[PDB]
């Protein structure tokens, strides 16, 4: 049923954002301890960009995975075309609410690099 | 090498369009079909990830500090890190390409337009050379178009 699709998407997103936070925390904890050569700074900024691209990519993938799961239920008439639309709307809401967390942590880290 | 040729065309063109604002009018391989549908998809989805993560992306672009062409080799390292946990999906893929477009826009504003093709050759080279069999198993760009299609 549609709730399990949306619930799955929600878990994926939540975990991907949790994972992004952990990774950026661990990255900061090493940047602070070490004496950063120009090189070691360059590497650290590369790992941060990768972490972000990874999270944004996985969120996106969870969301369009759920779009495929929903679109399939419709061809198995297990959801009427209104229920499909409540789903595609709550997915779109989920996408936005996860994108805002990625942007938040991206910036938080960006300031810890300049100032913190 | 068909898959490389086709992947470069798509990626290369999206990056150029994005940087300039002007859509190509030259003929692709596919008149009506797969490269065209992939470009259409990439415009919809990749324009979306750029709007929705403008903040994250500006942050990254500022710190990677992509002045010139040495710095373009450092995007490769970024791509390789992304994939280094073993996982490959189209979300990761479209997001790299969309970040590539974001940096291509940026290069154009510094009159480094000539670094846009190298950038695109370089995204393509990582993607195809390191995920070739995965892409083929997914039906290539046909699979891309299918995965993101909305109707």
The residue ranges of every structural domain in chain A are 1-116
d(CA B98, CA B57): 10
Structure tokens at A37: 């050569």
User: How many beta-carbon pairs under 8 angstroms link A with B?
Assistant: 90
Query: Whole-angstrom Cα distance, residue B25 to residue A31?
Result: 48
Resolution of the deposited coordinates, in angstroms?
Answer: 2.7
- Cβ atoms of B106 and B113 closer than 8 Å: no
Q: How was this structure determined?
A: X-ray
Q: Which residues of B touch A106 (CB under 8 A)?
A: 53, 55-56, 59-60
Q: What long-range pairs does B129-132 form, CB within 8 A, spacing at least 24?
A: B130/B80, B130/B83, B131/B83, B131/B88, B132/B3
Give the Cα separation of B63 and A17 in Å (integer): 21
Distance CA B129, CA B115 (A): 21
Architecture of the domain spanning A1-116: Orthogonal Bundle (1.10)
Cα separation, B10 vs A56, whole angstroms: 21
CB–CB of A56 and B60 under 8 A?
Answer: no
Residues of A in Cβ contact (< 8 Å) with B70: none
Please name which of A54, A106, A61, A17 lies closest in space to residue B96, comparing C-alpha atoms.
A54
Task: Work out the minimum CA distance from A7 to partner chain B, whole angstroms.
Answer: 19
- The answer to whether the Cα torsion of A10, A12, A17, A21 is positive or negative is positive
Cα-Cα end-to-end distance for chain A: 47
Secondary element (H or E) of residue A110: helix A81-114
B129-B135-B141-B143 Cα dihedral, nearest 10 degrees: -170
Nearest CB among B49, B81, B87 relative to A46 is that of: B81
Q: What is the CATH number of domain B1-148?
A: 1.10.437.10
Closest-CA distance of chain B to residue A110, Å: 6
> Would you say A60 and B48 are in contact if contact means Cβ atoms under 8 Å apart?
no
The residue of chain B with its CA nearest to that of A93 is B52
């Amino acid at each position: 049923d549609p709730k399990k699709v949306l619930d799955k998407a929600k878990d994926q997103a939540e975990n991907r954002v949790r994972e992004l936070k952990q990774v950026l925390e661990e990255l900061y904890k090493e940047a602070r301890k070490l004496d950063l050569t120009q090189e070691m700074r360059k590497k650290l900024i590369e790992r941060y960009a990768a972490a972000i691209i990874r999270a944004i990519g996985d969120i996106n993938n969870a969301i369009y995975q759920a779009k495929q799961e929903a679109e399939k239920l419709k061809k198995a008439g297990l959801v009427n075309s209104q229920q499909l639309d409540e789903l595609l709307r709550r997915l779109d809401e989920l996408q936005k609410e996860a994108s805002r967390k990625a942007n938040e942590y991206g910036r938080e880290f960006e300031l810890k690099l300049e100032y913190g | 090498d068909e898959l490389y040729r086709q992947s470069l065309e798509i990626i290369s063109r999206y990056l150029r369009e994005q940087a300039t604002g002007a859509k190509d009018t030259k003929p692709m391989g596919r008149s009506g079909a797969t490269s065209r549908k992939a470009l259409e998809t990439l415009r919809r989805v990749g324009d979306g990830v750029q709007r929705n993560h403008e903040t994250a992306f500006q942050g990254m672009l500022r710190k990677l500090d992509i002045k010139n062409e040495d710095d373009v080799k450092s995007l490769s390292r970024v791509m390789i890190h992304v994939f280094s946990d073993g996982v490959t999906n189209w979300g990761r893929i479209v997001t790299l390409i969309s970040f590539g477009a974001f940096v291509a826009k940026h290069l154009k504003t510094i009159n480094q337009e000539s670094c846009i093709e190298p950038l695109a050759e370089s995204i393509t080279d990582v993607l195809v050379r390191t995920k070739r069999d995965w892409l083929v198993k997914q039906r290539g760009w046909d699979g891309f178009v299918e995965f993101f299609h909305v109707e």
